């Protein structure tokens, strides 16, 4: 008969003395950019000995400033949603540059309301979702984003 396994996937790894897990939020620097991007790991696998992560993007206010009609909170960022260019990008695992603590304050029922402790330790907070097609912000979380169920893209199920 014979056995042949297909693609190896992962839930976690350690890189440069930091443990990263699926659905963690991370910094990623592009060459020539002064500020890092912030994104969420939504897949980890190995492909031809190369280690890859699929990153679902967050947007900092400066990154979508041209589409914003109103103000933002000091630590606010926005989770990409919808379908189209800008939603997500496959990245080398080696481009990950650190963990980012991002807390969701959405009233959506799939989000666990964060504790004061979690909010106190957050690098960024979000409750709005940037549709990359319309390029518009909404407080409505879609059923899924990038094929991932929405309840996996918010706060951890347990503090």
């Amino acid at each position: 008969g014979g056995i042949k396994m297909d693609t190896q996937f992962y839930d976690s790894f350690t890189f440069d003395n930091v443990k990263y897990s699926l659905y963690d939020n991370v910094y990623l620097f592009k060459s020539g950019e002064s500020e890092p991007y912030i994104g969420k790991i939504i897949k980890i696998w190995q492909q031809n000995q190369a280690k890859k992560v699929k990153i679902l993007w967050f947007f900092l206010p400066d990154e979508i400033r041209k589409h914003l009609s109103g103000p933002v909170m000091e630590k606010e960022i926005f989770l990409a949603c919808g379908e189209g260019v800008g939603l997500a990008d496959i990245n080398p695992l080696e481009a990950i540059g650190g963990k980012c603590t991002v807390l969701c304050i959405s009233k959506d029922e799939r989000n666990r309301q964060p504790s004061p402790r979690e909010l106190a330790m957050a690098d960024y907070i979000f409750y709005r979702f940037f549709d990359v097609n319309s390029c518009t912000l909404s407080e409505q979380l879609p059923e899924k984003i990038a094929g991932v169920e929405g309840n996996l893209l918010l706060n951890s199920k347990v503090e």
Binding site: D16, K30, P36, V85, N91, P92, G98, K99, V132
Partner: peptide, 18 residues
């Protein structure tokens, strides 16, 4: 905390974003 890497991130942006 952030830490710049030698290997660059890959990212596309929506129109008039970035």
């Amino acid at each position: 905390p952030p830490k710049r890497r030698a290997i660059s991130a890959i990212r596309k942006f929506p129109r008039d974003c970035g």
